[PDB]
Design a protein around this ligand. Structure first.
Ligand SMILES: O=C(Nc1ccc(Oc2ccnc3[nH]ccc23)c(F)c1)c1cccn(-c2ccc(F)cc2)c1=O
Length: 293
């Protein structure tokens, strides 16, 4: 039904729409398979003189109407998400006899977590610190628009052919369903999300980077993370992590949310650490983290 939903709100879906003949969505070519997400290879015909390859995520036709909204609603968020360290949507061409569309630019290298784990790759201490700096830049931008991510993690970050990191979100709320291992104390306790709780999340992300994609707190259950922290615990210093960068992770996990540094100060602090390295140090994988989920 198009008569309709929110005939004054869902009008923004006008701009984000493609022309008559300018798209081809192959299903023999599958970008993957999420869960309730349409992840397939996709071909787009941009005006002309341009050949754009993208990731296609447009949902079924007569799926319903109340479950359809929640979708076209989240695709709109990216309307004004224009930063080089943030993912954005190419458009939404709603078919007449097919379905309404969605489009995300194609990322050659996929998800940041899987890239660092591949053994055929050889990142250095500088490479990894540089991936972290790039995430801090995107968060400083989202923070300024008063936008709260809620799920900052290395698996939600993307990587293209130039090695530019793009923050994104791969489309219950009590105990198990949420990302309890990336959450701040106040968040786990009261279930309310803020930018200062995005800072906590960023420090876990910096941990994943220096261990080359290891899982955080592998011995502790999600049901009891609050109890484990409240004893006075934090993740350990990785082998290939610089002293000063560990001091920064500790600051992101400060007990009082208002004492944590801002994304602005993080960008500042991390660029200095970065600037003192050349690239003569290789990071190898921990045997004990190897083959662990
Ligand atoms: O539908 C989203 N995202 C998404 C992310 C990755 C996806 O998979 C690929 C895309 C391109 N190349 C690939 N190669 C292999 C896999 C792959 C993919 F299909 C979709 C999305 C929706 C709404 C809001 N936001 C959003 C953005 C910034 C933000 F900061 C928070 C939320 C999103 O990200």
């Amino acid at each position: 039904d198009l008569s309709a939903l929110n005939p004054e709100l869902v009008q923004a879906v006008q701009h984000v729409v493609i022309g008559p003949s300018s798209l081809i969505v192959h299903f023999n070519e599958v970008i993957g398979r999420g869960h309730f997400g349409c992840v397939y290879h996709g071909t787009l015909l941009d005006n002309d003189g341009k050949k754009i390859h993208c990731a296609v995520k447009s949902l079924n036709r007569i799926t319903d109407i109340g479950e359809v909204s929640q979708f076209l609603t989240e695709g709109i968020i990216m309307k004004d998400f224009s930063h080089p360290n943030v993912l954005s949507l190419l458009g939404i061409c709603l078919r007449s006899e097919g379905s309404p569309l969605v489009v995300l630019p194609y990322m050659k290298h996929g998800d940041l977590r899987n890239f660092i784990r591949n053994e055929t790759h050889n990142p250095t201490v500088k490479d990894l610190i540089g991936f972290g700096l790039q995430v801090a830049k995107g968060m400083k931008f989202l923070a300024s628009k008063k936008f709260v991510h809620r799920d900052l993690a290395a698996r939600n970050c993307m990587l293209d052919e130039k090695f530019t990191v793009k923050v994104a979100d791969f489309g219950n709320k009590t105990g198990a369903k949420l990302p309890v291992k990336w959450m701040a104390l106040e968040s786990l306790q009261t279930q309310k999300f803020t930018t200062k709780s995005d800072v906590w999340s960023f420090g876990v992300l910096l941990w994943e980077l220096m261990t080359r994609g290891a899982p955080p707190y592998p011995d502790v259950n999600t049901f009891d993370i609050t109890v484990y922290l409240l004893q006075g615990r934090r993740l350990l210093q990785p082998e290939y992590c610089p002293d000063p960068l560990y001091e920064v992770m500790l600051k992101c996990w400060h007990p009082k949310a208002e004492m944590r540094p801002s994304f602005s100060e993080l960008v500042s602090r991390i660029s200095a650490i970065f600037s003192t390295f050349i690239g003569e140090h290789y990071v190898h994988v921990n045997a004990t983290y190897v083959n662990v989920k």
